[PDB]
């Protein structure tokens, strides 16, 4: 089965590809989050032979193994349950399919854009078969403050600190766009107690995991008190959210705004009709993106006033 919890303070992951700057960012993030240990246990790359790579766990220097063969990495690091796949697009499909032969991997982030849709349908099919959650393709990934950050998600430490992504808040969110997810980090940190977990499902026609997949996880995560979805013209994904609320499956406050209202350049698929349907279903929908932060704030304050959210105490972050 697909897991409800994908990441935690103890997550260890394998990164496939040659991406030193990305790994160092994750470790820097791991450090300001006051994790006990680095979140990247090893790397995989068939284009080179085994070896080690140098990174910094705070001021302390450490070594991260790089394996030529995925098996060696899996075998030597069975504590790993996540793979971040930076494979270039000629390698993304085979490598992702191979990863799924190793059952310790419960979550795969696929970074590459440009994977043919027919290939992605096959990845989805196997993933669903194995109970593996896929985030992407064509995504920067996502972020769980205090716990784990996928690759470049959240940019530089400057942004991690400004948006307080180094410690959990009560607000979870999902969107297609990695650019807008970082904006959501910002909007949410200025209007609430901060992001609990954020996922960018990517822009491909068939994403490995959908808005509803994550909304379900969030609904089932006690730490999440409040859910933000940034929806979009095209397809009928957001109706699953209407049905979910009506059938009693979804009960937490959901804020949603679907972009693409200005499609004046099927009727039920427009942002306008989806916004309206969501609003009628009980979703908190702003009158425009311009008012999204306002509605998030209003829904938050009401959760505070009635005890559902207890804003924790700010604790400055480690060295940096």
């Amino acid at each position: 089965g697909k897991s409800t919890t994908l990441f935690s303070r103890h997550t260890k992951a394998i990164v496939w590809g040659m991406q030193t700057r990305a790994v160092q960012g994750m470790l820097d993030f791991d450090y300001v989050c006051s994790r006990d240990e680095p979140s990247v246990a090893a790397m995989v790359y068939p284009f080179t032979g085994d070896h080690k790579q140098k990174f910094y766990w705070g001021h302390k220097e450490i070594l991260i193994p790089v394996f030529k063969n995925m098996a060696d990495a899996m075998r030597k690091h069975p504590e790993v349950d996540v793979l971040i796949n930076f494979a270039s697009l000629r390698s993304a499909y085979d490598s992702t399919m191979e990863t799924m032969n190793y059952a310790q991997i419960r979550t795969i982030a696929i970074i590459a854009e440009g994977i043919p849709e027919a290939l992605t349908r096959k990845l989805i099919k196997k993933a669903d078969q194995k109970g593996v959650t896929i985030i992407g393709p064509a995504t920067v990934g996502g972020i769980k403050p205090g716990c784990f950050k996928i690759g470049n998600t959240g940019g530089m430490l400057d942004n991690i600190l400004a948006s307080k992504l180094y410690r959990p808040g009560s607000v979870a969110y999902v969107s297609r766009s990695g650019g807008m997810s970082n904006e959501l980090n910002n909007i949410i940190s200025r209007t609430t107690d901060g992001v609990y977990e954020g996922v960018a499902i990517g822009g491909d026609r068939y994403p490995g995991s959908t808005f509803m997949d994550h909304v379900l996880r969030y609904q089932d995560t006690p730490g999440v008190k409040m859910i933000v979805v940034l929806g979009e013209i095209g397809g009928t994904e957001e109706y699953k959210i209407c049905r979910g609320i009506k059938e009693g499956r979804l009960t937490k406050p959901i804020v949603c705004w679907c972009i693409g209202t200005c499609a004046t350049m099927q009727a039920s698929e427009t942002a306008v009709a989806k916004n309206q349907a969501l609003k009628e279903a009980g979703v908190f929908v702003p009158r425009s993106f311009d008012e999204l932060g306002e509605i998030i704030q209003s829904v938050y304050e009401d959760l505070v006033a009635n005890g559902v959210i207890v804003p924790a105490q700010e604790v400055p972050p480690p060295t940096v």
Binding site: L89, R90, E113, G114, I115, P116, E117, A118, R121, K122, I124, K125, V140, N152, T153, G154, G155, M156, D158, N159, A162, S175, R176, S177, G178, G179, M180, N182, E183, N185, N186, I187, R190, G203, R205, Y206, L230, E232, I259, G260, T261, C262, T264, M265, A271, S288, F289, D290, G293
Partner: protein
């Protein structure tokens, strides 16, 4: 993404690559005609144009050509020329699209009865590819989607020929089931092999002499080029039927093709006073929404984006194209340039803004003359440096430039620009 191909491209690929025992007729019998066509050499190249009567029609991604009377049927090479005089180069309107009819396909006329027309379509969904058949095809097919037999070929499944015969073809004439079934099997292998996502033949004609593909519409998954290049060759992806692309759009397209970054530009109203240059695909939709929400739809000049970590030079080339486009005619109320964006994860905002700054400096003269005011809001790696150099180029050039950071709600600058709220 999936992209439409011309009927001629689709037919060529089909004639070249379909593997079927079912005899397909008139392979490669088609001639393309434009307003530049040399009719002497066209005939010397397609001598078959004289052997029999013809059918001529536009091949520009227009649907329902028959029902809308855009097809000359059963004509001589002369009757085709005569049919084309009034039309070639002339405007036509279909739905709410208006454009010039400038690309035509001539093929042999195939005499056949109504009962020899059929419907086939294949198209992709998340759960696999649906194969459609109806035993009545052509113009009067009607609501084919509600009527056709449908068979889902699941992800990584095989299309079983007995399913074709026993489910899809249940209503087909019994003496045509074997040939139709052979054709569909081959059609699906071709669809899968050349990474199609949509392939419709309406009508498919089957006579005593074999199978004729009279009408074809198709899309392929363009990202599959690294796989299908050996088979596709230099495949072209036409725009929808409508206006022709402006030279600047074509330029930005060529820029796009030469980068991993996404460089997009479409002109809605080249005379509008409201111009955007947004980083982020999501952000660009949001800014467009906001402008329309605040009443500016008729002054919205363009939509598009420069996304995915473009270099300074690419960003310079993109920006100077917009700067040029907005200094062609003065507007009585001056103009607005919205340089907005979400907060980048990896894009070096300092490098991109350096390119934008170089552009503003190169067009500073006309920018003051056209009374352009610039609003800037951006976040991302090194964004503070980027915002600084944007403010600098403002003071330096005398062009009014208001810069904002992540403290300013992303769309707030749109209200400021339009005078719906004050500039802080």
């Amino acid at each position: 993404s999936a992209k439409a191909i011309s009927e001629q491209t689709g037919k060529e690929l089909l004639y070249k690559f379909i593997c079927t025992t079912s005899a397909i007729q008139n392979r490669f019998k088609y001639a393309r005609v434009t307003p530049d066509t040399d009719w002497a050499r066209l005939l010397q190249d397609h001598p078959w144009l004289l052997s029999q009567n013809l059918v001529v029609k536009p091949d520009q991604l227009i649907k329902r050509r028959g029902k809308l009377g855009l097809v000359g049927v059963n004509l001589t090479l002369d009757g085709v020329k005569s049919w084309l005089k009034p039309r070639l180069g002339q405007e036509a309107t279909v739905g709410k699209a208006t454009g010039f009819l400038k690309n035509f396909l001539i093929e042999p006329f195939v005499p056949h009865s109504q009962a020899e027309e059929f419907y086939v379509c294949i198209y992709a969904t998340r759960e696999g590819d649906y194969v459609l058949f109806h035993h009545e095809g052509g113009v009067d097919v009607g609501d084919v989607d509600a009527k056709a037999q449908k068979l889902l070929v699941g992800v990584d499944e095989k299309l079983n020929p007995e399913d074709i015969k026993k489910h899809l073809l249940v209503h087909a004439p019994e003496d045509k089931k074997e040939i139709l079934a052979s054709f569909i099997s081959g059609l699906f292998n071709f669809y899968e092999d050349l990474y199609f996502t949509y392939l419709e033949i309406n009508p498919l004609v089957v006579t005593k002499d074999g199978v004729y593909v009279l009408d074809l519409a198709a899309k392929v998954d363009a990202t599959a080029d690294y796989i299908c290049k050996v088979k596709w060759g230099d495949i072209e992806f036409p725009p929808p039927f409508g206006r022709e692309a402006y030279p600047e759009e074509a330029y930005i397209a060529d820029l796009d093709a030469k980068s991993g970054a996404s460089l997009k530009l479409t002109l809605l109203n080249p005379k509008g006073r409201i111009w955007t240059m947004v980083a982020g695909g999501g952000a660009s939709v949001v800014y467009s929404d906001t402008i329309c929400d605040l009443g500016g739809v008729n002054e919205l000049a363009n939509y598009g984006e420069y996304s995915g970590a473009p270099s300074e030079q690419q960003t310079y080339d993109y920006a100077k194209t917009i700067l040029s486009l907005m200094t062609r005619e003065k507007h009585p109320d001056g103009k607005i340039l919205i340089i907005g964006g979400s907060i980048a994860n990896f894009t070096n905002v300092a490098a991109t803004f350096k390119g934008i700054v170089r552009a503003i400096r190169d067009y500073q003269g006309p920018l003051k003359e056209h009374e352009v005011t610039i609003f800037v809001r951006r976040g991302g790696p090194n964004y503070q440096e980027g915002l600084r150099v944007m403010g600098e180029v403002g003071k330096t050039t005398g062009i009014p430039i208001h810069v904002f950071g992540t403290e300013t709600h992303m769309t707030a600058i749109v209200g400021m620009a339009l005078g719906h709220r004050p500039i802080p």
